[PDB]
Each structure stands twice: as C-alpha cells, then as structure tokens.
Symmetry: C2
Subunit: 110 residues, 2 copies
C-alpha cells in the first residue's frame, strides 16, 4: 500500500486549510506556521499545503509517493536508477527524481 | 474506494509518457494526440497528462476525486454545498480553491 502526496504552495494557508477541510471533510493532521498536513483515507492522499507568500496563485510544490517502510524506498530507488532516471537519495529515507517538465517527485516513508 | 486525479499540463507529452511509465512501472491506459492517462493501482491514482505547447515547465492543470458511481458524486455535491463551498453540479461537481486550483468530483 502507498498513497500519493500532493504538496501545494498556496498564497493563503489559512484559507486553504479551511477549503481542504471542507473538501475532504476532515481537519488537518498537523499544523505549523508555514504548512499543514492532511492524511486523507478516501481518496488515499497525503496533502501538504505550504504557505508561499508573494506568489498570487496556488502552484505545485512537489509530488510524492508515501510508502509503508524504508525497504520500499530502497526498491523504488533501485528501480528508478535501473530505468535510467537520475536520482538522489536521502537518509533521514527518501529518493528524488524529476520529470522532463521539471516536476519533482519524492518516494518516501513518513 | 475513490482515487485522486492529478492532471499535469506538460511541455512534452512523449517524454512525459516515457517518464511516468518508468516512475509508476506501467504504461498509459489511454493515449490520444495531446493527451495521455495512466490508471495506477499503487498508489491509487488517475494521472492525466495534457500537452501544453508553449510553457517551459510542467504545471498543475486541474485536480480531482474520481468516484465509483453517480450517487457518490451526488453525495459529495450535497456535502460540499452543505458545508458552504460554492459548487457547480453536472455527473460531475466542480469547486475551486482559494488559490484558484480547480477541483472536480466525477465518475470514471
Ligand atoms: Ni514532501
Ligand atoms: Ni480530468
């Protein structure tokens, strides 16, 4: 099991939290000044809202695949390199790749 | 059992199909000129690729929740409206976030 992660850079964190609470019918799991997390069961989704003052519209910050444990990150990382994609891994585990249009993807364990 | 729909406007559809096939380990379900879509089981995702032509970078086109049946759409439509969001309905419902990001609830 895994779920997608969608991380949005939003102009108004408070308005966005209010909106996403109503859309998915549940409050954020974690709230800090500067970002909030929703863990949505249905549809399965980890939604990250990142305050991006200055910018005037919501844009994509990055995308991700949240997997159950580190071994899955490892399998993903190996498979991605095998397919010939450039990757960068982090420990404390996460692997990053970038789509041809520049959209960043991370495979990670929460 | 619903799934998110992620629609990306991409500068190069062909390279993108190649990239997502590798990323998710499975080819697209449907391909037309200017358009491809992937139905991914794990993680559950409908990924839509839309040829942009012009833009220099991928951008979010729209977002969605894909549900199993017409009645699920009707339920979401009533829920969203009752919760005070400004919705437009139909079987499809559209709502837009404060930052202008468009959402739709729809059936496959
Ligand atoms: Ni993240
Ligand atoms: Ni769509």
């Amino acid at each position: 099991m895994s779920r997608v992660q969608l991380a949005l850079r939003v102009p108004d964190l408070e308005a966005s939290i209010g909106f996403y609470s109503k859309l998915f019918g549940t409050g954020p799991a974690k709230v800090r000044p500067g970002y909030a997390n929703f863990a949505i069961a249905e549809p399965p989704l980890k939604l990250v809202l990142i305050e991006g003052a200055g910018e005037d519209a919501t844009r994509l910050d990055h995308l991700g695949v949240e997997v159950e444990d580190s071994a899955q990150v490892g399998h993903a990382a190996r498979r991605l390199k095998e397919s010939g994609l450039a990757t960068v891994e982090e420990n404390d585990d996460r692997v990053w790749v970038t789509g041809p249009g520049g959209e960043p993807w991370e495979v990670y364990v929460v």
